[PDB]
Amino acid sequence: TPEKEPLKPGDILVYAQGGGEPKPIRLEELKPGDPFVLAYPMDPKTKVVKSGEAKNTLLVARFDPEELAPEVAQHAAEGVVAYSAVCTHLGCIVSQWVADEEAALCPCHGGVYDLRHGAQVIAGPPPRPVPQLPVRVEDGVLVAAGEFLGPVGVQA
Numbered sequence: 001t002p003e004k005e006p007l008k009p010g011d012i013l014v015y016a017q018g019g020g021e022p023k024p025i026r027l028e029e030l031k032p033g034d035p036f037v038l039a040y041p042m043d044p045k046t047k048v049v050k051s052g053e054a055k056n057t058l059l060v061a062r063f064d065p066e067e068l069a070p071e072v073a074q075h076a077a078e079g080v081v082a083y084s085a086v087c088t089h090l091g092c093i094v095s096q097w098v099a100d101e102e103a104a105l106c107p108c109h110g111g112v113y114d115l116r117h118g119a120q121v122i123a124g125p126p127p128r129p130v131p132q133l134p135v136r137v138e139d140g141v142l143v144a145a146g147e148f149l150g151p152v153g154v155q156a
C-alpha cells in the first residue's frame, strides 16, 4: 500500500499524526536542545504519509551545529538531525528523551542512543546505532536528503 511504501529521498518530514491533515516539520519550530519529535516521511506530491510502515518512523532533533560530531554534521541541516526511531535491539520505537544526555531512550530494554554523536549506543542492548537519515531544508521545511545511512531496525 502507498502508506507502507519506504521512505524516499525528497520526502517531506511530518510530525507523527493520527488522522487529519499532516503537519510538515519546519526548521523554525525546532528549538536547539529541545527533546526530539517522532516523524514520518510524506510523499511530496501525493501527500501520502508513509506511516503504515514502522521502519519509516523517525526521530528528529535540533542541536547547536557545533555540538554535533563532524560525521553527524555532514548529514545535518542547520543543526537538525534525524535518525530511524526503530530500536536495533528488538524493534521497539525509541520514544523517550534523556535530558541530561541529549539521548534517545528505548523503553523496552533501556537502549540509549547518543544523538549528537551519531546515536552511539551508550546504554542497553542495541547492537548498533540507529542509522542517521540525511536531511535538508527546503522553503523552511525538513526533507529527507538521502537514504538511511545503514539498515533499519532488527537485523541478523
Ligand code: FES
Residues within 6 Å of the ligand: 087, 088, 089, 090, 091, 092, 106, 107, 108, 109, 110, 111, 124, 125, 126
Ligand atoms: S527493543 Fe530497544 S532496547 Fe530492546
Ligand SMILES: [Mg+2]
Residues within 6 Å of the ligand: 028, 029
Ligand atoms: Mg512555533
Ligand SMILES: [Mg+2]
Residues within 6 Å of the ligand: 067, 068, 069, 116, 117
Ligand atoms: Mg561532543
Ligand SMILES: [Mg+2]
Residues within 6 Å of the ligand: 109, 110
Ligand atoms: Mg530498566
